[PDB]
Amino acid sequence: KETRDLETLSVNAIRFLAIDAVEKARSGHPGMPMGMAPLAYLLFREVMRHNPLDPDWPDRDRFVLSAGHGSMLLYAVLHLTGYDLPLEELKSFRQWGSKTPGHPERGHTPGVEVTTGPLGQGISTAVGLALAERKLAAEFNRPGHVVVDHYTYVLASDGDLMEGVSGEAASLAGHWGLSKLIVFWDDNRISIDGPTDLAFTEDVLARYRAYGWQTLRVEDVNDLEALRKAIKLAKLDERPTLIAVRSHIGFGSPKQDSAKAHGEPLGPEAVEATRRNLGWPYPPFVVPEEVYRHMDMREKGRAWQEAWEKALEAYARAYPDLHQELMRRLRGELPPLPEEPPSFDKPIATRAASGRALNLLAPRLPELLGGSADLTPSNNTKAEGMEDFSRANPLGRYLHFGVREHAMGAILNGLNLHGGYRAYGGTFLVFSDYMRPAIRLAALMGVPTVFVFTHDSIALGEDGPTHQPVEHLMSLRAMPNLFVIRPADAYETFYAWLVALRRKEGPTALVLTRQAVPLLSPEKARGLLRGGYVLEDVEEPQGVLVATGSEVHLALRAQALLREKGVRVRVVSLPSFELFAAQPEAYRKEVLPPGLPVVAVEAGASLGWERYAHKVVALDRFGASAPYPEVYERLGFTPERVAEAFLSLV
Amino acid sequence: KETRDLETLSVNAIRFLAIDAVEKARSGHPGMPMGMAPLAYLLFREVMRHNPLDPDWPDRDRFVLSAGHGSMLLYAVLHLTGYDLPLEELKSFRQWGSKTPGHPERGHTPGVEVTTGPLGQGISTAVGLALAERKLAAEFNRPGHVVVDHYTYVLASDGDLMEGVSGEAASLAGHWGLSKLIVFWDDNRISIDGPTDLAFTEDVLARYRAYGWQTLRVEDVNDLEALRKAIKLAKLDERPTLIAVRSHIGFGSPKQDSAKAHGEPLGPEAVEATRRNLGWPYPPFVVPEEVYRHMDMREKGRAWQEAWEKALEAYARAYPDLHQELMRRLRGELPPLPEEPPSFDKPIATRAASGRALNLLAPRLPELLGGSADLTPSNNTKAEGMEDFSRANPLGRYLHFGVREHAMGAILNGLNLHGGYRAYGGTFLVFSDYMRPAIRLAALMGVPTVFVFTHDSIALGEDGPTHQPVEHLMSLRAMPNLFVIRPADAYETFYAWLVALRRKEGPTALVLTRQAVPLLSPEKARGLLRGGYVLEDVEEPQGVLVATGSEVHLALRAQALLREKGVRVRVVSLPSFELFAAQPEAYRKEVLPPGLPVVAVEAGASLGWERYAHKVVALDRFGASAPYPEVYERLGFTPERVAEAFLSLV
Numbered sequence A, B: 001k002e003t004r005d006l007e008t009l010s011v012n013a014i015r016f017l018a019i020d021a022v023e024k025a026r027s028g029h030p031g032m033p034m035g036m037a038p039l040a041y042l043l044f045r046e047v048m049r050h051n052p053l054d055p056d057w058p059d060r061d062r063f064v065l066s067a068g069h070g071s072m073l074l075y076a077v078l079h080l081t082g083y084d085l086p087l088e089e090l091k092s093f094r095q096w097g098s099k100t101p102g103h104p105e106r107g108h109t110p111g112v113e114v115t116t117g118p119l120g121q122g123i124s125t126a127v128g129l130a131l132a133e134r135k136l137a138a139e140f141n142r143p144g145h146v147v148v149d150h151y152t153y154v155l156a157s158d159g160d161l162m163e164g165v166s167g168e169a170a171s172l173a174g175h176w177g178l179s180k181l182i183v184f185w186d187d188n189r190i191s192i193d194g195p196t197d198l199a200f201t202e203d204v205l206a207r208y209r210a211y212g213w214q215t216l217r218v219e220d221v222n223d224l225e226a227l228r229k230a231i232k233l234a235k236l237d238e239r240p241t242l243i244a245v246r247s248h249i250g251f252g253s254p255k256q257d258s259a260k261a262h263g264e265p266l267g268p269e270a271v272e273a274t275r276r277n278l279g280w281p282y283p284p285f286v287v288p289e290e291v292y293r294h295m296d297m298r299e300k301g302r303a304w305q306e307a308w309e310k311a312l313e314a315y316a317r318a319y320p321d322l323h324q325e326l327m328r329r330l331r332g333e334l335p336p337l338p339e340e341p342p343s344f345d346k347p348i349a350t351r352a353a354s355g356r357a358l359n360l361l362a363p364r365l366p367e368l369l370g371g372s373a374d375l376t377p378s379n380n381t382k383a384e385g386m387e388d389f390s391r392a393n394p395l396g397r398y399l400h401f402g403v404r405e406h407a408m409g410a411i412l413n414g415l416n417l418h419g420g421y422r423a424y425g426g427t428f429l430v431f432s433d434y435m436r437p438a439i440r441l442a443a444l445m446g447v448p449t450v451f452v453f454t455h456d457s458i459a460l461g462e463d464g465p466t467h468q469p470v471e472h473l474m475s476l477r478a479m480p481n482l483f484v485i486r487p488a489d490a491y492e493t494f495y496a497w498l499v500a501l502r503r504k505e506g507p508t509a510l511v512l513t514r515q516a517v518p519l520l521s522p523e524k525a526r527g528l529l530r531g532g533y534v535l536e537d538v539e540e541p542q543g544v545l546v547a548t549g550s551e552v553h554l555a556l557r558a559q560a561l562l563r564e565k566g567v568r569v570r571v572v573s574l575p576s577f578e579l580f581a582a583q584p585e586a587y588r589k590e591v592l593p594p595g596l597p598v599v600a601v602e603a604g605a606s607l608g609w610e611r612y613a614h615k616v617v618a619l620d621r622f623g624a625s626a627p628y629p630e631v632y633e634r635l636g637f638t639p640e641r642v643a644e645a646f647l648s649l650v
C-alpha cells in the first residue's frame, strides 16, 4: 500500500497538473488526461526505456499521443520524469511561446515524438516509426550485436479510430506484421457530440482482428496489474496489438462520464470536488517531493543510453563499416551526391526521367526508401536495385502502400521521423487530395518527406477530369514549408531530386508528366537550383514568357513564333516558386526585370500567377476525357495562344 | 439451354463491346468489365427497376460504378438496354466531346448516377443515396401509399475497399442500418501493382461484419443463379450487405488473372484469342439483334414508371399537401425564404450568427439536412427544431457523422444528388483537407453541397497551428465550381446562406470565425450578394483596403487610424472572389478603381491576392497556441501594421 499509495499519489500528480494547467489556461482538455493518467504513469515510469536527458536517444521507445487534445497528460508526465520542461511551462499551457502548446508540437517540446491534434495522424504516423525500427533492425542487427530494439506505443481516442487514415494504416501494419507496435484505445464511450453510440457502434476490436492485429481489453485503466499483463502479452505476439482500455473521461469529478469533461476547464467548483473525491490536499501545480523522487528517470535513462552507447562501441569493433553507416544515417548526414545528371538522348516523360534519377541515386543511398499507392508502373518510383519490403523480406526498400494515399503520407512521415531513413512515395498529383493532412503535418513538423506526383496535367489524356489536376499546384504552393518543384525536362528533374534530398527544413512535392516532353541542355537546367532562371535569353528583351514544367516547351515554341514577327521575349523556367523567392532580390530582378511585360504559361489554376505575370495562359475549368495532345490544344495550350497573349501587352 | 444461350450471348455482348471500345480508343480498362459482365447483365436485365426512356425517374433503383475505371462495363449495358447511348458513342470511347469519357461523369451520359474514378467515392456517395431514399420514404410514405421504394446498388473494386473513405462510410451505413444498400466487390485478387497480397491481405468481410453489414460470397460471377440468391438474401436482411463476387480479371483472354489486363488495351493477338476461347464470331461493335431485343428495357421501363406515376396521382388525391411538397422537393424548387436577417445586438462569432440564420431558415425548409463530423457544439449546425437522425428516428434532420469528414463529404454529395434533400455538414476549415476529394467531386458534378467551415483563422486561439488554417482559403478558391464565402459579420453571414441555398450549379464553402467580431450595418452587409462592395467610402480616396471575413473589422480600424493622420482610404468587403468576378467589369472597377493603390488583409496565405492588391497583410507561416486577440496581434494583424503597409505605398 506504500507502493500503491506512491502509484496513486504519482497518478494523481499527473491528474492535477493537467486539471490545474487547463484551469489556469481557461482552455484545454482535462477529461481524457484525468482518465488516462494511469497509462501515462505506467509507460513513462515502468514500461518504456527512454532518457529525459536525451530525448533523441535513437534506441528509445517512442510514445505517440495520437489523441493530441490530451496534451497535458504528456506535459505532466514529461515534467514529472525529469525531461527539460519546467513547472513554469505547465503554468504557461496554451500561452504564446510556451513549450506546452494546446496540441503536441514535435521540435517545440522535448520528448514530443509527433505533432498530433488532427485525429488519425498520430496512430497512422506511428506505423512508420515501427516500420523504421523493424527495417533498421533487419539492416544492422547481427549475432550478439542488437543495436536496434525499441517499441512504438500510441494512445488513441474514438476519433482516431473513426478517421479512415487509421484503418488504412492498420491494414498495412497488420499486412506487414509490425509485432512492436502497441496501441492503447481510450474506450470511454464519450465524443464531442455526446455518447459515441450517436455515431460509432461498430465492433472496433473485430475490425482490428480482420486487419491481422492482436486485440486485448483492460476493463479498468486504474488496474496497473491488468495494463502490465496486456503489454507483456502484446510483446510476445508477432502481430501489432490494439489494447482497448475502458476509462471514465473526467475520472474522479462531477463531469465524469460526460462530453462536458472533453474540451473546457473543469471550473473552480468541479476542481474543488475532484480534490475532495481523489484525496488530493496539494494546491495548484504543487506536487510532493516523494513523487518527484519516484518519477525521476534521469538516472535510469543515463544507464539505458550508456548501455546502448557501449553496445555501439562493441558493434564498431566487430563491424566498423556497418557502424559508420548507422552513425551517418542516424545523424541524417547525406553521402556525397552525383553532380552529373543521367544521359538522355530522346524525349521522355518527367516521370520516366525521375525513375532514371532514382536509378542513379538509390545505389549510393541505402537510407532511400521508395513506394507508391498502387501506381508503381505509372509513377516510376521503384529504383533499379530496390526489392519489395514484406515480413519475409524486411530488407526490401520498396513499399507497396496499396490504394491508401493518406496512410502512405502518414507512414512516409513516420519513416522520416524515426532516424535512419529518407522515404518518398508516389501517386497521381490529383490524389494529393487524399493525403493533404499528412502533407500539412510534414510541413508542420519540418519532416522532409518527398511526395512524388505524376500525371501533373490535362496532358495525361483520356483518364479525363476526375484525374486531371487544375487547382493542385496553387493549392500546394499556398501551404507553408512545402517546396513544389515542377521540372521542365529530364535534366531539371535530376536537379529537382538533388533539391529535394538536400532540403531538410520540410517536405518537397516533385511534380512530373505522364506524357513525353523534349530535353533541355543539362547546363541550362542546372538553373533549377535557383528555382527560376533565364532558359533562352535574347538581345534587349521586349518581355518574358515565364513557364513551369511541360509549359516551358510551349513557351519556347511561342518565343520562336514571336521572333519570326520581330518581337523578342526571353523564356524563364520557374520550376519552384519557393526556391526562387528565397533568392536574393538582385538575382530575381535579373531574371524578371521590372518594367518588362510578362506572360505566365502553366496548365493549372491562374490564381497566384499575378505575383509574376500581367497575363496568364492557365486553366480555370476541369479537364476532359480525350487523347494528348488534342486535349491540351483544344483547352488552349498552343504556342499561337501564348504568342497572342504576349502581343496583347504591346 | 436457349435462355442459357441468350444469357451467355448477352453477357458476351457486354464483354466484347468493352474489349473493342478499349481496343479502338487504344486506352482504358478492359479487364474488370470482362470479369464483371455477368453482374451488369443481371442488374440491368432482371434485378434493377429502371427506365432507359427516363433516367431521371425519381423511384428508379440507383447503380454506382465505384470502380469507375471499368466505364465500358456501364457504357455497354446502358447501350444494350436502350438508354440514349448510340453504338457511335461506344466507338468514341475517351475521344473529345463523346458521351463515353474514360471515367463515368454524372450529367454527361444518360443513366450515370455519380462521377466516379477517384476510388472510394462511388461506394461512399451510395451511403448518401441510401440515407436519402430511407429518410424520404419515412417522411412521405403512407398506409396504402408507397411513393419511395428503391435500392442503391454499388460495384466496388479492391481499391475502393483499401481507401479509408469507404471504411468511414461503411461504419456509418452499418450504424444507420441502411437495409437497401447492396455492394458487389470484385474480389479478383489483382491490383495495378500486381497480386493484391503485395499490399492487401486483410479479411475484408470480417471488417464489414464488424461494421454491422451482412456479408455473402459468390464463388463464381458466371453463376447468375448464385448472384440471384445473394441479391435476394441482401433484400431480406435489415443490414447493408457486401457480396464478395470472385471473378477473373481479363476473363477469357491470355491476360486473364494478370495486372496487364487492368489498364491497357488487350492488343490484336489477345483480342483475337479472346473471340476464340469464348467463341464470339461477330466483328468489332456488332451485337446480334437477338441480344438487343432480349436486353431492351424500354417496355418494362415505361411500365414500372407508369405504375409509380399512377401511385403518385392516388397519393395527390389522398394526401394533397404532402404530394405538393414532394413534387416541389424532387424538382429542387426552393419555397419562399426570409429576406431580412436575424436581429443581432452584440459582437458575435459568424459560427453563432450562422446558427441564428439556420434557426430562421430551417423551419421554412423541410428538405434541409444538417450535420457535423463530431463538432456539433463548435459548428452551430444543429438548427433549433432539428432532431438526431438514427435507425430508431428516421425523420431526424440532423446527422452526427462522427470524426469522418471525408465520408461526410461523400454522404452529403449522395444526399444532394438523390433528390428531395438539401444537405450541409460542418467541420473546422483546417479539416477540409480530410474531405478534399469529395469537395472536388461536388464541384465536378455541379452538386450544390454546402460545406460549413468554422475556426477559419489563427483567431481561433489556443488549439494552435494544427487547427489554424493558412493555405485553405486560396487552396479552395483555386478549385473550379466552388463558391468560397467568408462573411465579415452576423449580417454578411445571413446573406451567405441565401447565396449558398440559391446557388444550384455547384458546391459552396461557408467560412466562419470561432471568435466574436463586431456587427456591421444590416443594409451595408447586403453588399455580400455582389461578392465584393464598398463597406465604408471616403471623399476623394487616396487608396483602398480590401478584406474578407474577420479582417474587414481590422481594415475599418486601420481606415480610422489612417484618417487620424490625414490619409483617406475606402474599405471594400470581398466575402467571395467568385461572386465578385461574376459581376460586370464596370461594377468591379467602381469597387476597386484602377490607379488607386490597394492593400489586402486576410489571416491566410498571400498567394492569389496580387489579383486585387499591390501589398497584402497575410500569414505565410503556420500559427501558434495562444489566446485571441494576442495570437492574432503578435502574428501581425493589427491596425498599426495594416496602416504601416498602406503608408509604404501612399
Ligand SMILES: Cc1ncc(C[n+]2csc(CCOP(=O)(O)OP(=O)(O)O)c2C)c(N)n1
Binding pocket: A031, A032, A067, A069, A117, A118, A119, A120, A157, A158, A159, A160, A163, A186, A188, A190, A191, A192, A249, A262, B373, B374, B375, B403, B405, B431, B434
Ligand atoms: C481529423 C480531425 N477532425 C476533427 C477534429 C476535431 N476534434 C477535436 S477532439 C474531437 C473528438 C475527440 O473525441 P475522442 O477522440 O473520443 O476524445 P476523448 O473523449 O478521448 O477526449 C474532434 C472531432 C480533430 N481534432 N481532428
Ligand SMILES: Cc1ncc(C[n+]2csc(CCOP(=O)(O)OP(=O)(O)O)c2C)c(N)n1
Binding pocket: A373, A374, A375, A403, A431, A434, B031, B032, B067, B069, B117, B118, B119, B120, B157, B158, B159, B160, B163, B186, B188, B190, B191, B192, B249, B262
Ligand atoms: C483514389 C485513387 N487512387 C488511385 C487510383 C488509380 N487507380 C485506378 S484503378 C486502381 C486500382 C486497381 O485495382 P482494383 O481497384 O482492384 O481494380 P481491378 O484490378 O479490379 O480493375 C488504381 C490504383 C484511383 N483511380 N483512385
Ligand SMILES: O=C[C@H](O)[C@H](O)COP(=O)(O)O
Binding pocket: A377, A378, A463, A514, B069, B192, B262, B263
Ligand atoms: O487508372 C489506373 C491506370 O492503371 C493508370 O491510369 C495507368 O496509366 P499510365 O499509362 O498513365 O501509366
Ligand SMILES: O=C[C@H](O)[C@H](O)COP(=O)(O)O
Binding pocket: A029, A069, A192, A262, A263, B375, B377, B378, B463, B514
Ligand atoms: O477538442 C476539440 C476542440 O478543442 C473544441 O471543439 C473547440 O471548442 P470551441 O467550440 O470552444 O472552439
Ligand SMILES: [Ca+2]
Binding pocket: A157, A158, A159, A186, A187, A188, A189, A190, A191
Ligand atoms: Ca472518446
Ligand SMILES: [Ca+2]
Binding pocket: B157, B158, B159, B186, B187, B188, B189, B190, B191
Ligand atoms: Ca482488383
